[PDB]
Paper text:
Extended Mu was purified from E. coli for cryo-EM data collection, and contracted Mu was obtained by treating extended Mu samples with urea. In contrast to the extended Mu, the DNA and the TMP are ejected, and the external tail sheath contracts toward the connector complex, whereas the inner tail tube is exposed in contracted Mu. The release of the TMP and DNA in contracted Mu results in a contracted tail and an empty head. However, in both extended and contracted states, the head and the connector complex remain unchanged. Comparison of the structures of Mu in the extended and contracted states reveals that the connector complex and the tail tube remain unchanged, with the exception of the C-terminus of the tail terminator gp37, which extends to accommodate the contraction of the sheath. The Mu portal is constituted of 12 copies of the protein gp29. The Mu adaptor is constituted by 12 copies of the protein gp36, each of which comprises an α-helix domain and an elongated C-arm.
Numbering used by the authors:
A (entry chain B): 2 to 304, 322 to 401
B (entry chain A): 75 to 293
C (entry chain C): 148 to 220
D (entry chain C): 2 to 74
E (entry chain C): 294 to 304, 322 to 401
Write the structure that this text describes.
């Protein structure tokens, strides 16, 4: 009953979800700050430094606002995140697998391909690309004679503050200096480190906050410029001493100028037209284009080999996280004997580049004569 | 960052193997294969390779080794990437990284407990060979140009709206004039006495060509 | 016993529960709101962006370019 | 007769449509707000935040107006 | 351009990925709420929740008939290619 985790520390496993503990009811329900309203680079630096020190709430809210506000950023982020979901995967057994190990690996493979909550797990784990860390709870359930998850809820990333000590262990916030640690076997954590460093640093929001600010400020300034451009101000200079009644009619006239407007004014009055916005759209669009290009560079790598390498890298990191926290827990809970930590099934994504069928088909039969070429190596390409 | 990640992910893409020593005997080949399989089946090696790429820009990637007992093999169980600022080069011989201990010489590294990867792109000492030495100048130029360009767009294309009230105007007629001159928006149109003026003076004149030229050169 | 017609009710009639923020509940002028009758509500939550039920719509991202384009036009 | 749902909670299934329950007759018939008339970014942010908090009505009406108004969209 | 980027992904692989993703989400929703209800209502025994029919969309990319036709007979000699796999492309 005293199940050991991956690190070999015995503990007692509890079916109750850590959030639903009747003690964190008033700290798991937070109304979002929306800090991206009127951001100044000084304040963005301040929230980034607060996140670096350990308080990740402001950074997570800022990342969420950046995801939903900047349309180009969202398009690029979705383009990157859907690359991962497209890859086909299988639970390849441990190397030199025996009978039972291969059978258990195949059982896990079939169950995961026939579980509706795995695709949600993979889609939500892609949130760590921008915020830095995707944390999902595991609501354990009884499926026949197998203790397997029945739902993976994606908790808000702002609820987790890094420990002030060792700065790499995500701890659920409990209004404490150290913070409440994660309940074992009940928190699917995927830390996607694009940049080496600590848990708060490795998010792409650190790099993308500046182009986001520049692009959005330029866009708003450009829109306000178009609000005024191409329509000159219409000022009338009534002679001094005019009665208080003749100013009202003059103002109602000068505000009545429309299409083909034409009227009469006394010799003492003037109706000069002064421009209220002079310039062109070249600077605003230049800044917008540069910022969008920078955002695309940060997200994908270039505005096709680089995108493939990005996909392979972050897919490998996700696979390592899954092996840590979605295969070993199932094996340990379902089985009763001490699970061999050295040899356990691991998820593998089919990230191999597709093989051009025509070149292989007109090349292999030519090399085959003379060379023993395994059918399998060839069977890997397509079927 | 995009270029640095593009370079660092090239290394991780390469496949590797623990090739035995040349003219390997039986036992040497078997040990080499054992190491190969163990390292391909250890989760902390990929982290080691990803963190060792930090030396590209800073100059030196230092990772501690938390030794652990795996059956009957004393092998690492976790490689923590310590902050590079904690290490100061020895004032003597200037090539041995020593953990800082508030001392002149500094505490040396504990043996068999510090994975050090000194990526020398340029010949020289440990502090020199980082790419930050070369890249600090284009970084400064590009970022200063970018901030200046953004501040220029903050002001460009919206002329300053100054009103010249005749002197001797009551202290109440200056407030209304200022609230009017700050009420100019889309299709704004109003009346001013003959003695007042509403000249529009530009507050930022120029174009985006120089800023973008400098940004392109720096990139 | 199979469906004979699927009526598309107006999405404004549904308010997310103030608790757990992911269960769509038919609005009944109540704080919690009337829950959906089982086996009688075909619900398809298309999450383009990770988050809650109200967040994952594309209107959140597209409201700004829509405003800018239409004001400019 | 006590059919269980996907989540294994027994219940009684009813053929009557939930809307046609003689209690939600005055809340299933709403005349649309059309909030996209004279939208200011402040007000768009306000309705987005209201939708985030749970009241999805304004967001849905805004999305409908965006769908029928912006031709490219 | 921004609206097109948000909707499709680019103003042709990206559109295919978008279609596959949202079609998969729709298929999961249908399996949750348009197959199990029919099975539970029509049948009287306890429906096996673990094993129930699921809707699948034919999202596989079309196969160029000329390349397959002049490649497979060249590989077939020597390798046991299954007619089925080939039958998936078109008929």
């Amino acid at each position: 009953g005293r199940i050991l985790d991956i690190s070999g520390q015995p503990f007692d496993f509890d079916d109750e979800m850590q959030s639903r503990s009747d003690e964190l009811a008033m700290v798991m329900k937070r109304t979002q700050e929306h800090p991206s309203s009127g951001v100044t680079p000084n304040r963005a630096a301040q929230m980034l430094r607060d996140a670096e020190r350990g308080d990740l709430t402001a950074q997570a809210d800022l990342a969420f606002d950046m995801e939903e506000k900047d349309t180009h950023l969202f398009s690029e982020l979705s383009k990157r995140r859907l690359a991962i979901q497209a890859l086909e995967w299988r639970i390849a057994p441990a190397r030199d697998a025996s009978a039972q190990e291969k059978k258990d690996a195949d059982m896990l493979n079939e169950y995961l391909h026939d579980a509706a909550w795995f695709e949600d797990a993979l889609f939500d784990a892609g949130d760590a690309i921008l915020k830095g860390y995707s944390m999902q709870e595991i609501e354990w359930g009884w499926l026949g004679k197998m203790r397997v998850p029945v739902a993976l809820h994606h908790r808000d990333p702002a609820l987790f503050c890094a420990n002030p000590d060792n700065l790499n262990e995500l701890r659920l916030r409990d209004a404490s200096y150290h913070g409440l640690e994660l309940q074992p076997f009940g928190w699917f954590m995927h830390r996607a480190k694009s940049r080496t460093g600590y848990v708060g640093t490795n998010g792409l929001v650190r790099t993308l906050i500046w182009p986001f600010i520049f692009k959005n400020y330029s866009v708003r300034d450009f829109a306000e410029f178009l609000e005024i451009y191409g329509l000159p101000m219409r000022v009338g200079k009534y002679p001094t001493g005019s009665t208080n009644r003749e100013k009202a009619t003059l103002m109602q006239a000068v505000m009545d100028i429309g299409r083909r407007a034409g009227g009469i004014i006394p010799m003492g009055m003037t109706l000069d037209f002064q421009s209220a916005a002079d310039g062109q759209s070249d600077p605003f669009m230049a800044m917008i284009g540069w910022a969008e290009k920078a955002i695309s560079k940060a997200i994908l790598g270039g505005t096709d080999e680089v995108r493939r390498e990005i996909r392979n890298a972050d897919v490998g990191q996700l696979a390592r996280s899954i092996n840590r926290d979605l295969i070993y827990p199932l094996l340990a809970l379902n089985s009763d004997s001490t699970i061999d930590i050295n040899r356990l099934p691991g998820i593998v994504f089919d990230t191999s580049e597709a093989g051009d069928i025509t070149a292989l088909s007109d090349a292999i039969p030519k090399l085959a004569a003379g060379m023993r070429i395994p059918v399998s190596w060839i069977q890997e390409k397509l079927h």
